[PDB]
């Protein structure tokens, strides 16, 4: 039928009927904007960004709410749709208030993400901080050491106290990585293009770095014996250590960049040579000519430039200074020359300038350091005449000025006074400024000041294939400007090499400019970290460093003080994405009203900001139509429309479940989830696909992390439905806990002593062997938790077998659900995927409260779901239900053939009367063609499960598709623990403890000792081992504790409630050193069973466990079910001894007794809920 073939945007597509055009274009990779669209709920039609032009319809049709037909023509980028989307986005931006990026990053010329790496330092991830920094420059330590930090001026912490020392943190992290493992960023595969870079300054080095990172081959031609440019030959040693720069350039050279020294372009190698032999040329020559005194007698011997003097100082040449030195100028050159001459044996140095101290262009810190060192300032003075004798200059004549009106740049103009003064000197150094010289390079256009003329935004000179940047274009400026220009020019050159030149253009962000000190009166005040500066005694005579780098403690203390000004949703916000894509300006107005809120919702998990809302309605639609709590709703009309909780109450006082679906469907930053880490940040986080470790539903999750810290959890919308509950969303926060154990401890004299892993292994094996020797067989019980993977449970069973015991148990499993004795397998007879096609679902227990994602799925399915009444708590009512089902005409012959003991059961129910409600429920179950039963194991006794199985068996609604019993378990791998044999009841363990038969216990991940009776039972032991993550109540009373890792650091598999085996992948490396599987493998190697890796364990599981045959090549990335990869159990008969269902009479039953929680993680979550 050429499956519904359509034509969109000129292309021909094959799609499926009943879809939406938006879904089809997403399937075939065509981008159509949308904000209020979600495929799992009904269309809303609010934004209007998804309008497309369909031939035959005079008006625009929304692609989110129209069905694909055969042979329709669609256009998504016509002028009408473009202007409609532009208008909608302009109207949306007229009410949106926020900071897309913090002021500190926007003030930096290179746009380095200061908030991101400051926050990453505050979380203790230094390598990730350097990975953030090195996306914008290749030399972070030097730049952090010398930058005048314009970013630090714009920091909003200035509104409270001194701002964050951003540059010192950058230098600290760069030095910590240089002393440790040097980072090399990944490179694209080689493209074969050749780029020649003239000059190895910051601009040239940055261009070469960012061009070699794109696969090209870069060669640097340098006119000096060492690389660095004015960072080497202009910055003195006591401010920037040259060894640091040499090490950084060596790191860059290790990437494959060839630097050719002693080669001057124009004098030694012509530029035509580079033009002919290379695919691109980038000129980063910089400004290297000293301005003269611009006065009479400036050519006299004894007057030298500041730049040449500094270069001669750097090359360790022979210089002459004499006693008295006069430096003319006020920039950074004058300061550096003055202090260098002070360190070079000059007894007195004088600085001469024309404006006030307050109008010096140098930094105030450098001026104060120079004043402390001993250089005297001579003020309000300009050059007049240089007086000398016999070709030697000894005096400088000058005029005295006076203060005048401020200029347009904010500095007071000097005015002459007519007073002359002469100054004695032995050397005069002119440090007025630098000027660009082009040298012998020809056919390059230059401006009136000597700078290279380039096309703005494209960095192209008059000559083709030749580019320029840095001080050659902007004149003398700070180093970060040169780095930014080099990076932008590298991007432009890379685009040019691909055949299409695109100019560099800035981006649009939302910014807020009304923040004042009165808005930050609730913040605490913390003093800034002072810098340790060497005393003025040693500074005046030596060239060593005057300041020391931050220590780790100081860096943490400084970094934990940021305010997090930026938006946390920036890297996933769609409003800003469409604003950048559709060229919409974010500048505000004054008359238009953006309503500013004074909201206060201190919910511990959910954050709502009404200012960033776009009224897409996804959050309220999800919370009503899926979750069903309806904790939020719309209030008002028009501009007063706002989404807010029930009766304007706080979200904590309403029916909210903190599931986080409203957070996960929001397209902007209005709804946000709270922070799992120590200090959360806006960042591009790595994602790992795993499954939830709390319930038997086993929802797939994506763990978003940065380094060794997990930051958030999101649903997996591709492989599952994409729903989560509070435990899945906010439950991985124990992986970052600082109270986790790190090394095993052995008790001696009543105190725990830290031991090595080998000593721990020896101690546990020898003590277990001693217990076995002293008390014989069956003296050891193995108590495990159902949270462990399949391989760890199999290895624990192997350890139980090899230690000569049969007591393997769990407090959570506590003997299983009782369905095993009737049908043969203690497992669900149907999968979750069959809840969609059933026509009746009967729920037993609190399925909604305990496993809520299953309730979401049942509600979205729309099938008729009837809950078992609460006023029927005893099983006499279930016996009445059985009698009512029997009276409705069941086939007795088939149930006589396929079951054992049907006649006795029928005789037992002979005198049972039937009530009306029971009759109605029985009728509803009887007329249903394909009825399912969903039983919550947390709130239903085993005998009720047996009676429900009897009801399903006698009606013949079991053993086939879309009919049976679905049983949801308490924990993630309760089914796996059942399938490995951990099905012994706990009462046997208690009795064996109190009868003296059991002398030792091995507890893996459980906390039985939190209750007084079990603690009293454990106190009568002889040797107890606890494997746990935390020093719980049980581990305190043990004789030996071994740490465990969390579910974010383990590789393995989990068996779902419906017998589905899902792979669990490790996001971060084990913080204790060894995984649980490794610990069990070494213990079994000590006991004499040899396993190497997880493949051997999986092969052993396949070859020893009966129903997991095929796990060796199972490919757990797809759907794997353990009974012969079948969704339905008992298709060819039950799995009992005689292939018949075993029906046995059950007695009178009291009200259900609520079960307890024994897994340490699941009680830690409950206790940590109360902390906020």
Ligand X SMILES: Cc1cc2nc3c(=O)[nH]c(=O)nc-3n(C[C@H](O)[C@H](O)[C@H](O)COP(=O)(O)OP(=O)(O)OC[C@H]3O[C@@H](n4cnc5c(N)ncnc54)[C@H](O)[C@@H]3O)c2cc1C
Q: Residues 390 to 449: which contact ligand X by CB under 6 A?
A: 439
* Coil vs helix vs strand at 514: coil
1115 touching a copy of itself, by CB under 8 A: no
Based on the shown chain and the rule CB under 8 A, indicate whether residue 289 belongs to the binding site for a copy of itself: no
What residues numbered 639-668 form the site for ligand SF4, per CB under 6 A?
643, 656-662, 665-668
Q: Closest approach of Cβ 70 to ligand FES, in Å? A: 22
Using DSSP, state whether 617 is helix, strand or coil. coil
Strand order in the sheet with 392-406: 381-389, 392-406, 412-424
Q: Say whether residue 144 binds ligand X (CB under 6 A).
A: no
Of 121 and 143, nearer to ligand SF4 (C-beta) is 143
Is 76 a binding residue for a copy of itself by CB under 8 A? The answer is no
Confirm whether residue 594 is marked as ligand binding: no
Let me know: does 935 contact 965? Beta carbons within 8 Å. yes
CA 809/CA 780 separation, integer angstroms: 11
Region binding ligand FES by CB under 6 A among candidate stretches 43-51, 271-279, 522-530, 538-546: 43-51
Which of 271, 326, 724, 952 touches ligand SF4 (CB under 6 A)? 724
User: By C-alpha distance, which of 574, 595, 576 is closest to 585?
Assistant: 576
Distance CA 1049, CA 1033 (A): 24
Say how many CA atoms lie within 13 Å of 714 toward its Cβ: 19
403 DSSP β-pair partners: 414
- The binder of ligand SF4 chosen from 6, 50, 614, 951 (CB under 6 A): 614
CB of 452 to ligand SF4, least distance (A): 24
Task: Tell me: does residue 64 bind ligand FES (CB under 6 A).
Answer: yes
Of 75 and 435, nearer to a copy of itself (C-beta) is 75
Q: What are phi and psi of 1008, to 5 degrees?
A: -75, -25
Using CB atoms within 10 Å of the CB of residue 465, give its burial: 0 to 12 exposed, 13 to 18 middle, 19+ buried.
Answer: middle
Q: Provide the 3-class DSSP secondary structure of residue 767.
A: helix
**Which of 8, 15, 21, 47 touches ligand FES by CB under 6 A?**
47
Beta pairing partners, 435:
289
Closest CA to 109 of 656, 652, 479: 479
Show the site string, 102-121: x = touches ligand SF4 by CB under 6 A, - = not. xxx---x-x-x-xx--x---
Helix H or strand E encompassing 904: helix 902-908
Q: State yes or no: residue 71 binds a copy of itself (CB under 8 A).
A: yes
Phi and psi torsions of 248, nearest 5°: -65, -40
- In whole angstroms, what is the distance from residue 462 CA to residue 467 CA? 9
Please list every residue from 678 through 707 that binds ligand SF4, using CB under 6 A: 692, 694-695, 697-699
Q: Between 281 and 579, name the residue whose CB sits nearer to ligand SF4.
A: 579
Binding segment toward ligand X, per CB under 6 A, in 70-78, 330-338, 547-555, 940-948: 330-338
The H or E element that residue 866 is part of is strand 865-867
Sign of CA dihedral 1002, 1004, 1008, 1009: positive
Q: Which of 791, 834, 855, 1006 binds a copy of itself (CB under 8 A)?
A: 834
Radius of gyration of the chain (CA): 38
Residues binding ligand FES: number (CB under 6 A): 12
- Residue 536 and residue 862: Cα distance in Å, rounded? 81
285 binds, among ligand X, a copy of itself, ligand FES, none (CB under 5 to 8 A by kind): ligand X
| Interaction between residue 858 and ligand SF4 (CB under 6 A) | no
Residues 186-245 binding ligand X (CB under 6 A) are 198-203, 221-224, 229-231, 234-235
Select the residue whose beta carbon is closest to ligand FES and give its number: 64
Contacts (CB under 6 A) with ligand FES, residues 614-673: none
For 264-308, list the strands marked E by DSSP. 280-283, 289-290, 303-305
The pairing of beta strand 671-673 with beta strand 606-608 = antiparallel
Q: Is 864 annotated as a binding residue?
A: no
Rounded to the nearest 10°, the torsion over CA 173, 175, 177, 181 is: -170
**Residue closest to 771 by CA, chosen among 536, 1021, 557:** 1021
Residue 989 found at the interface with ligand SF4 (CB under 6 A): no
The interface partner of residue 909, options being a copy of itself, ligand FES, ligand SF4, none and the CB cut-off 5 to 8 Å by kind, is: none
What is the Cα–Cα distance from 240 to 244, expressed in whole angstroms?
8
12 sits near a copy of itself (criterion: CB under 8 A): yes
Residue 793 within binding range of ligand SF4, rule CB under 6 A: no
Alpha-carbon span 629 to 656, nearest angstrom: 6
What is the rounded CA–CA span in Å between residue 1100 and residue 701?
A: 29
Q: How far is the CB of 826 from ligand SF4 (least distance, A)?
A: 20
Residue 330 marked as a ligand binder: yes
Residue 727 binding: pick among a copy of itself, ligand SF4, ligand X, none (C-beta 5-8 Å cut-off by kind): ligand SF4
Identify the residue among 171, 350, 451, 831 touching a copy of itself (CB under 8 A): 831
Q: How far apart, in Å, do the first and last CA atoms of the chain sit?
A: 60
Give Cα 1115 to chain centroid, integer Å: 28
Q: Is 265 annotated as a binding residue?
A: yes
**666 annotated ligand-binding residue:** yes
List the structure tokens of 1141.
Answer: 């269902």
Q: 565 is in the binding site of which of ligand SF4, ligand FES, ligand X, none (Cβ under 5 to 8 A by kind)?
A: ligand SF4
User: Which of these ranges, 178-186, 244-252, 471-479, 661-669, lies near ligand X under the rule CB under 6 A?
Assistant: 471-479
Of 569-588, binders to ligand SF4 (CB under 6 A) are 569-570, 573, 575-576
169 binds ligand SF4 (CB under 6 A): no
Binders of ligand SF4 among residues 43 to 102 (CB under 6 A) are 96, 98, 100, 102
CA-to-CA distance for 414 and 694, rounded, in angstroms?
Answer: 76
Contact track, ligand X, 91-130, x by CB under 6 A: ----------------------------------------
| Two structure tokens written together for 706 | 């940065």
Residue 656, annotated ligand binder?
A: yes
CB 582 to ligand FES: min, Å: 15
E strands present in 110-268: 194-198, 217-221, 258-260
Written as one string, the DSSP assignment of 796-826 is HHHHHHHTT--EEE-TTTTT--S-HHHHS-S
Chosen residue from 319, 544, 774, 833 binding a copy of itself by CB under 8 A: 833
Contact 295, 386 (CB under 8 A): yes
What's the CA gap between 692 and 690, in Å, rounded?
A: 7
What does the per-residue mask of binding to ligand X show for 148-167, with x meaning CB under 6 A?
Answer: x-------------------
Residues 6+ apart with CB under 8 A from 907: none
Is 857 labelled a binding residue? no
Alpha-carbon distance of 1075 to 722, in angstroms, equals 29
Tell me how far, at minimum, the Cβ of 464 lies from ligand X, in Å. Answer: 20
Distance CA 309, CA 539 (A): 20
Instruction: Kindly indicate which of the ranges 59-67, 457-465, 533-541, 823-831 contains the residues binding ligand FES, using the contact rule CB under 6 A.
Output: 59-67
User: Footprint of ligand FES on this chain (CB under 6 A)?
Assistant: 34-37, 45-48, 50, 62, 64-65
**Residues of each annotated binding site for [2Fe-2S] cluster:** 36, 47-48, 50, 62, 64
User: Footprint of ligand X on this chain (CB under 6 A)?
Assistant: 146-148, 198-203, 221-224, 229-231, 234-235, 264-266, 284-286, 288, 332-333, 336, 439, 470-471, 477-479, 482
User: Footprint of a copy of itself on this chain (CB under 8 A)?
Assistant: 1-3, 5, 7, 9-12, 16-18, 55, 70-71, 73, 831, 833-834, 836-837, 930, 960-962, 1124-1128, 1131
**Residues of each annotated binding site:** 36, 47-48, 50, 62, 64, 96, 100, 104, 108, 146-147, 151, 155, 203, 222, 230, 239, 265, 288, 291, 330, 332-333, 353-354, 434, 471, 477, 479, 562, 565, 567, 573, 613, 616, 619, 623, 656, 659, 662, 666, 692, 695, 699, 725
């Amino acid at each position: 039928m050429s499956k519904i073939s359509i034509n969109i945007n000129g292309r021909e597509l094959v799609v499926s009927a009943g879809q939406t055009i938006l879904q089809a274009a997403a399937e075939h990779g065509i981008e159509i904007p949308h904000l209020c669209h979600d495929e799992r709920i009904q269309p809303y039609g609010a934004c209007g960004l998804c309008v497309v032009e369909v031939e035959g319809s005079p008006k625009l049709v929304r692609s989110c709410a129209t069905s694909v037909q055969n042979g329709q023509v669609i256009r998504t980028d016509t002028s009408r749709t473009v202007v409609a989307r532009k208008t909608a986005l302009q109207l949306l931006a007229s009410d949106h208030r926020g900071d897309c990026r913090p002021p500190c990053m926007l003030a930096c010329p290179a746009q380095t993400d200061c908030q991101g790496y400051v926050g990453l330092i505050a979380n203790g991830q230094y390598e990730e901080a350097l990975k953030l920094i090195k996306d914008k420059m290749p030399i972070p330590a030097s730049i952090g050491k010398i930058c005048p930090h314009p970013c630090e001026t714009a920091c909003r912490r200035e509104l409270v106290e001194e701002p964050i020392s951003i540059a010192q943190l950058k230098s600290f992290v760069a030095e910590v990585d240089l002393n440790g493992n040097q980072y090399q960023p990944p490179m694209k595969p080689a493209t074969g293009k050749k780029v020649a870079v003239v000059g190895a300054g910051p601009a040239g080095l940055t261009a070469a770095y960012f061009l070699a990172r794109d696969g090209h081959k870069v060669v640097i031609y340098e006119a000096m014996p060492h690389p660095g440019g004015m960072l080497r030959y202009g910055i003195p040693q006591y401010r920037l250590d040259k060894a640091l720069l040499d090490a950084e350039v060596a790191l860059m050279t290790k990437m494959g960049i060839e630097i050719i020294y002693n080669t001057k372009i124009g004098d030694d190698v012509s530029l035509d040579y580079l033009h002919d032999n290379y695919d691109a040329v980038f000129l980063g020559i910089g400004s290297w000519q000293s301005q003269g005194l611009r006065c009479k007698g400036e050519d006299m011997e004894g007057v030298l430039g500041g730049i040449d003097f500094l270069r001669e100082v750097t090359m360790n040449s022979n210089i002459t200074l004499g006693g008295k030195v006069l430096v003319v100028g006020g920039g950074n050159t004058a300061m550096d020359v003055a202090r260098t001459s002070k360190r070079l044996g000059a007894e007195e140095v004088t600085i001469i300038y024309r404006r006030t101290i307050d109008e010096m262009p140098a930094e105030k810190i450098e001026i104060h350091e120079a004043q402390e060192e001993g250089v005297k300032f001579q003020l309000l003075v300009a050059p007049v005449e240089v007086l000398g004798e016999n070709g030697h200059a000894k005096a400088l004549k000058c005029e005295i000025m006076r203060l005048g009106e401020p200029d347009a740049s904010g500095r007071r103009k000097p005015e002459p006074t007519g007073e002359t003064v002469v100054y004695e000197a032995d050397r005069i150094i002119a440090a007025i400024g630098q000027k660009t010289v082009i040298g012998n390079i020809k056919d390059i256009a230059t401006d009136k000041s000597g700078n290279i003329i380039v096309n703005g935004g494209a960095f192209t000179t008059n000559r083709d294939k030749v580019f320029a940047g840095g001080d050659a274009v902007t004149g003398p400026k700070i180093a970060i400007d040169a780095i930014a220009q080099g990076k932008n020019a590298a991007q432009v050159i890379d685009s040019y090499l691909n055949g299409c030149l695109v100019p560099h253009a800035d981006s649009q962000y939302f910014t807020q400019k009304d923040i004042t000190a009165a808005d930050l009166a609730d913040r605490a005040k913390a003093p800034r970290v002072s810098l340790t500066v060497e005393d003025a005694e040693v500074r005046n005579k030596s060239f060593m460093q005057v300041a020391k780098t931050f220590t780790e403690e100081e860096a943490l203390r400084e970094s934990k003080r940021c305010l997090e000004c930026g938006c946390r949703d920036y890297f996933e916000c769609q409003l800003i994405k469409y604003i950048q894509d559709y060229d919409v300006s974010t500048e505000k107005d004054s008359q238009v009203e953006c309503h500013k809120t004074t909201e206060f919702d201190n919910h511990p998990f959910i954050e709502r900001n009404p200012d960033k809302c776009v009224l897409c309605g996804l959050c309220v639609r999800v919370c009503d139509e899926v979750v069903g709590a309806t904790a939020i709703g719309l209030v008002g009309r028009g501009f007063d429309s706002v989404i807010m909780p029930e009766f304007k109450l706080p979200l904590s006082e309403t029916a909210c479940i903190s599931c986080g679906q409203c957070v996960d469907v929001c397209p902007t930053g209005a709804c946000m989830e709270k922070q799992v880490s120590y200090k959360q940040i806006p960042a591009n986080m790595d994602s790992m696909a795993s499954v939830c470790g709390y319930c038997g539903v086993g929802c797939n999750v994506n763990i978003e992390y940065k380094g060794d810290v997990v930051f958030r959890v999101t649903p997996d919308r591709v492989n599952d439905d994409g729903w989560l509950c509070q435990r899945g969303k906010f439950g991985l926060g124990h992986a970052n806990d600082k109270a986790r154990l790190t090394a095993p401890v052995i008790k001696r004299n009543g105190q725990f002593v830290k031991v090595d892993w080998n000593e721990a292994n020896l101690e546990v094996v020898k003590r277990l062997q001693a217990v076995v020797a002293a008390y014989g067989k069956d003296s050891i019980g193995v108590v495990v938790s159902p949270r462990l993977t399949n391989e760890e449970l199999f290895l624990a069973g192997k350890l139980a077998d090899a230690v000569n015991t049969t007591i393997k148990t769990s407090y959570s499993v506590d003997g299983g659900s009782g369905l095993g004795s009737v049908l043969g397998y203690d497992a669900s007879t149907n999968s979750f995927a069959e809840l969609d096609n059933s026509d009746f679902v009967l729920t037993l227990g609190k399925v909604k409260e305990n496993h809520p994602v299953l309730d979401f799925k049942i509600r979205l399915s729309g099938v008729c779901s009837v809950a078992w009444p609460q006023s029927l708590a005893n099983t006499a009512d279930m016996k009445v239900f059985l009698k009512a089902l029997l009276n409705l005409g069941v086939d007795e012959n088939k149930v006589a053939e396929k079951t054992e003991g049907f006649a006795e059961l029928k005789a037992s129910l002979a005198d049972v009367k039937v009530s009306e409600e029971i009759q109605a429920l029985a009728q509803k179950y009887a007329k249903a063609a394909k009825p399912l039963i969903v039983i919550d194991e947390d709130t239903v006794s085993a005998e009720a499960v047996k009676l429900m199985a009897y009801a399903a068996v006698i009606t013949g609604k079991i053993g086939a598709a879309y009919r049976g019993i679905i049983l949801v378990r308490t924990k993630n791998n309760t089914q796996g623990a059942v399938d490995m044999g951990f099905v012994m009841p706990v009462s046997a363990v208690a009795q064996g403890i109190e009868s003296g038969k059991i002398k030792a216990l091995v507890v893996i991940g459980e906390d039985p000792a939190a209750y007084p009776q079990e603690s009293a039972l454990l106190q009568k032991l002889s040797f107890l081992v606890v494997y746990d993550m935390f020093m719980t109540k049980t581990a305190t009373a043990a004789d030996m504790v071994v740490p465990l890792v969390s579910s974010a650091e383990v590789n393995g598999t989990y068996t779902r409630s419906d017998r589905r085996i899902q792979a669990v992948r490790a996001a971060i490396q084990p913080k204790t050193g060894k995984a649980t599987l490794q610990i069990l493998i070494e213990t079994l190697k000590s006991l004499g069973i040899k396993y190497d890796t997880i493949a051997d364990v999986r092969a052993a599981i396949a070859s020893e466990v009966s129903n997991y045959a095929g796990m060796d090549a199972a490919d757990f990335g797809t759907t794997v079910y353990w009974p012969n990869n079948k969704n339905v159990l008992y298709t060819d008969g039950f799995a009992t001894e005689g292939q018949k269902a075993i029906l046995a009479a059950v007695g009178d039953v009291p009200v259900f007794v609520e079960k307890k929680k024994y897994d340490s993680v699941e009680m830690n979550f409950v206790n940590g809920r109360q902390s906020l």
